[PDB]
Each structure stands twice: as C-alpha cells, then as structure tokens.
Amino acid sequence: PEDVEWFKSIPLFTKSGRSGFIKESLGTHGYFKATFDGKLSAQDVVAMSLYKRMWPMPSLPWN
Amino acid sequence: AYTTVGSILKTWTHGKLPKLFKVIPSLRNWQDVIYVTNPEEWSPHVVYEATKLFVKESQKFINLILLERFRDNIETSEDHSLNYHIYRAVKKSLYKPSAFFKGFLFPLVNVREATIAGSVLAKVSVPALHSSAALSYLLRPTTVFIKILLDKKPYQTVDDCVYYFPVIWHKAFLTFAQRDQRDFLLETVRQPEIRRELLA
RNA sequence: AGGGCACCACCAGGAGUGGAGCCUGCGGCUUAAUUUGGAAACUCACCAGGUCCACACAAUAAGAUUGACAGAUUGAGAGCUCUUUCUUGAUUUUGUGGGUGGUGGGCCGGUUGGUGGAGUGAUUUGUCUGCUUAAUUGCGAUAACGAACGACCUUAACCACUAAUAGUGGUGCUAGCAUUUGCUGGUUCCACUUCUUAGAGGGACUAGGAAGGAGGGGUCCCUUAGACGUUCUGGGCCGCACGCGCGCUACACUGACGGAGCCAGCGAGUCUAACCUUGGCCGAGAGGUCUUGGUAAUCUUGUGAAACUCCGUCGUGCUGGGGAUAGAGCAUUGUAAUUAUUGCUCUUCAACGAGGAAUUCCUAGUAAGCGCAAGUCAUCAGCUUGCGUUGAUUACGUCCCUGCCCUGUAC
C-alpha cells in the first residue's frame, strides 16, 4: 500500500486508449481501485508510464 | 426414525458426515430406506458425498437420484449451469460405464442440457467395448452425443455407422471422414469438402 | 403576442418542516475492510490467515490405482494427510509439446393517401370567410369528391333470488327481584329471512335527483493450471470534526398522574407437522407450566384497541412537563448476544420556554388527531401498505409567481 499511495498522482491509461486515475489503496497486498472513461473488461490491460532524462555520451576519434 | 437425523444431514455442507449416511449402503432395503431420508432435499455437497459412497443397482441409484438431481439443477439453476458439486458428482460418478449409459446415457436422450452432459462425458476415457455399445445404441440433436462419441477415435460398428448417412451434423459427419453403399452416400452429398475428402 | 389549463401554481386558510434530543438515507472523513449504488453465522459481493483440486509427445503397471475401522496433526483438520493394513483392478501415473472453452467481449419494452383541378418545376387544393368543442367535435360555403389510425370494462347506489358456519321470535326446563303477573338472565326443540351474508338478475339520456363520478432503447478476435476455483475460523457492512434530506418524541392546565366507565373494521393462522392460542395454576413484572379449539363466516375473536367520558391529586415553579446519557440486577430467541436482539425492576434526570432566511401537502367523511392488522421474519421497526375511530377552518376564483399547451421572416 505504501507504494500505491506514493505514485497516486500519476495518470493511468489502457492500451485500448482509455484514461483513468487512482482512487485509493485497497487492503494490504497492494490492490487499488480506479475509475475510467468507460466499460473495461478482463481482456484489457492497465498501464502507467514513467520518464527519465537521457543525456548524450561523449565521443572519441578513431583510426 | 432415522429421518430425525436425516433432517439435520441436509445441511452437511462441510466436515464429517453423519454415521447414518455412511452405513446406509450396507442394508438391502436401502432402495426403500433411502426414500425416508430423501437426499434430494439435501445440500449439493452431499450429492457428491453420496455419489462417492454409492459406488448393478448403482444404475437404479444413478438413474433414480443422480439423473433426477441433474435435471433439477440444470433446469432450475438461474444460469442453467450445474453446480460445481453436482458436476463433480457426475464426472466422479460413472466409474462403471454401463451405469452411466444405462442410467443416463439412453434415458437422457433442450439442446443446452445435451451440451453440458457431453462436457463431462468427454472428460474421461471409456473402454472400447463400452464405447462401441453406446455408439450402436445411439444408431437408432442427440447426434451431439454421437459427435462426442465419435471424437474419441468393430465391423458391426462400421455397419451401424454407414446407415447414419445443422452445421453440427455436417461437422460430425466430417469427423467420420477420419475413420457399395458408399456410392449412395456420395449420391446424397451430390443432392464439397466431404465429397472431395470422401474420394480418399 | 394573444389565449387556455394546474393546490407537483397562486389567492383565502389549515397542519406543518427548517430551531432541541434521538432514529434513518446519501455525500465526505477514517480504516486491514468499512462491498456495491428489516446484514450477529449464512446472506456476502469486502478484509486477515489456512487447507484442497484438460487434450497431444517420452518413462511406468498387473498391481496404474480405488475405498475404509480406532486414534491423530493447526490460530483454521479431515481415511483426499498420518500410526496400524486391509479391500480392489487398468477406470491410470511422472516428465516434455499451441487450448480450448458447461469462458470473455439468437429475442423484447393529434396524424395521411386515391381520383380530379392549377404550374416547366418545388409546391398547391381537398385541410375554408364566418359561427361552435377537451378534440379532425359540427352548420354552411364550393375545383373538388369520396376514403384511413389514435382519442369497454369494473366500482358507490336501490330493489325480485339465494343460502344459512349469520340473526330474530316462540316453546320446554331454570336463577334472581317483585308479587297486576310482570322485569333482567342461563341452557332442548320449532317457525322465519326483515337486519347480515355472498353470489346472481334489473335500475340518467343534460333532467330536479342515490349519482348530472373514480380506476384500468433493452436482452469475428483475446485467454486458460490449480485461472476469471472449492471450503473453514475470526472481523466489517453499525466506525464519525461535518454537510444535505425523510421522520419520532416534546416545550405542558384544551395538561400530567390515579381509580372507574367502555365502543370497531380490513387481515392471518398446524399433521410436512408444531402455527394462531382460550381455560386452570405459579410469579411484582417480563415470563413459566398443565390442558384445549381451529386446515377456519364455525376456534383465537364481541380481536372488551387508543384517543375519549366521569370522579380525585397536582398549581404555574425547566415543576409531579420532557426522558436523552449512564449504573446494578432479573428473563426470552439463537450454534453464538462482548462493540451488547428485545423485554422487565430500582437508581441517574441532559437539551428543549413554540423556533431566521427558505420550503412541503391539502377542497369533505377530505386535513389533522388516535390505534390496529399484514409484509420482511429464529429474534429484531421510530419503516411501507391497508383498515377503522373522532372529525374542523377556508375557496367554489385567477393568470400575479412557477410550469405546460395552442394559434413576420431563408432564418
């Protein structure tokens, strides 16, 4: 549950393109419940993405 | 007076069953004495508990109670699907194949009830001498059991099948292609994957 | 713009709600969970922790495997596990390869044409200048004439006919009072049908009169080993700084308390077994115990209900109004009442002195006051529906407010 709360503000999306948000933690095993634009079903998957800055590497002459 | 205990045994949904339910098969009057407890008023878990305890009178018990409960569950259930313990009792029953076919196989002859019965009857092996007898007796939507009995892969059996000449009926005949009257069958089909595959 | 209609609109008014305590629904908060949008187990869908359970290749067996006394192992346990060792027979076991499906995403709940007339057409007439209704409901007029959906059935109320498990009277016997031979009762037959009954038959058309009515849009793809599982113990759904709403009980004398009087209608009830319970006995009470009638117009039951009426105590003092919160004890249902189902007894004695802005229902046996039965249901109502008892004030109108409906321009 402590993880579920810590990320709560990040938005969610389905790979079918629907969007949603975390409401709250449920129980001790890290379940959570969420709300979406429309009727999901057990064939759907729910995802959220996190981003990190990449910086260029340096370069060297060659022979 | 044993029905005074049976009136409590209708709740035996878990744990050890009453001793009157364990010793009942030892009495030769049980075909009448079981009528005083009337397990058809009992919880479904006892039906499996009984189906493991009743294992030629098993055909009379299998037909007199097992087939009676199976019809009530499938016909009365709010989704039309048998309870897990009912299904487990049937698939765990039939440990003598003649008791299954003679008890329910022939007497069970809408379409939804036929489909559920097949989903159990295909779940376990059967003897070749037992399976051939069922295929002949079926040669007299009931073909959905014939399509199931044909899916498991004698000269009198081939002779009964040759006289057998919906999309489920065509596909069941198409499975029969997996093995002079054969000219008449081709003449019927000429009335095409079976006509080409029938050329093999 | 006009015009029409309605106590889910107003006017004249009634009862109020909004302010207090408590019950209850929703939102929010909290939490392991407080599931989702007449809950102590089960229900159950939620939480913590435990058991138990396809097809197609390679190895294996006459012993693959199946069933079972007595006892046992955990927080939660059992001949699917275990000590002991019988019974039984190919119904099948261990690895390795794609999954297929008792698997997800077929059936229902005021409105126009024909033929004729006009126009190159889109259009038009019929469907109208005038007069009527809730209405395409009608006179008349005349390039029109003749046609098609939507908008009969049961109550109230009088009377012949049924029948009796309902009622009345008489007769036999019999108690008390008084003694013209009366009056008030109890318990064997006979006559009747008016009251009751319930079923059937007939009884307003705009004509003074019972009455110039009330009601009938929904249900090909993906994924599969213990997989959209089975079952046990304990907890929660009842947690509460708060916001919104339906209610119950009160603020007293048109009253509270004590004794006495004393009257309904609609329901529902067991042999499947244990429902509705009279009568006797015990107990302060709640309650207990021995018998009994009823599958019911027959017995519970005249459901002897409450408000109400009469005679007393209290004397305007948060008082003898009001009874939240809380302590101790005695019972009943249930496997189990702790965070406490319900009932009884003694003690404790809170807010509340008629409620701002806002706001609901209502035109006669109606509003309001009062109580009873049924539903759910082991127990558990301040809830929902119905029934009866007592029984007013104020209109008999309008378009002011709210809301609905109808009858210049290519926009």
From Swiss-Prot, chain A:
The protein's location, in the record's own words, is: Cytoplasm; Nucleus, Nucleolus
Instruction: List the residue ranges forming a coiled coil, or say none.
Output: none
Task: Give the free-text miscellaneous remark of the entry.
Answer: Present with 1390 molecules/cell in log phase SD medium.
The annotated subunit structure for this chain is: Interacts with RIO2.
According to its UniProt entry, what is the function of this protein?
Required for 40S ribosomal subunit synthesis. Required for normal export of the pre-40S particles from the nucleus to the cytoplasm. Its subcellular location and association with pre-40S subunitshifts from mixed cytoplasm/nucleus to all nuclear in RPS19 disruptions, suggesting it acts after the ribosomal protein.
**What family is it from?**
Belongs to the TRAFAC class translation factor GTPase superfamily. Bms1-like GTPase family. TSR1 subfamily.
Q: What is this protein called?
A: Ribosome biogenesis protein TSR1
* Taxonomic source organism: Saccharomyces cerevisiae (strain ATCC 204508 / S288c) (Baker's yeast)
UniProtKB/Swiss-Prot annotation, chain B:
Q: Where in the cell is it found?
A: Cytoplasm; Nucleus, Nucleolus
Coiled-coil residue windows: none
Extra remark beyond the main annotation: Present with 21600 molecules/cell in log phase SD medium.
| Function, in words | Required for normal export of the pre-40S particles from the nucleus to the cytoplasm. Its subcellular location and association with pre-40S subunit shifts from mixed cytoplasm/nucleus to all nuclear in RPS19 disruptions, suggesting it acts after the ribosomal protein.
Family under the similarity heading: Belongs to the bystin family.
Record-given protein name: Essential nuclear protein 1
Species name for this entry? Saccharomyces cerevisiae (strain ATCC 204508 / S288c)
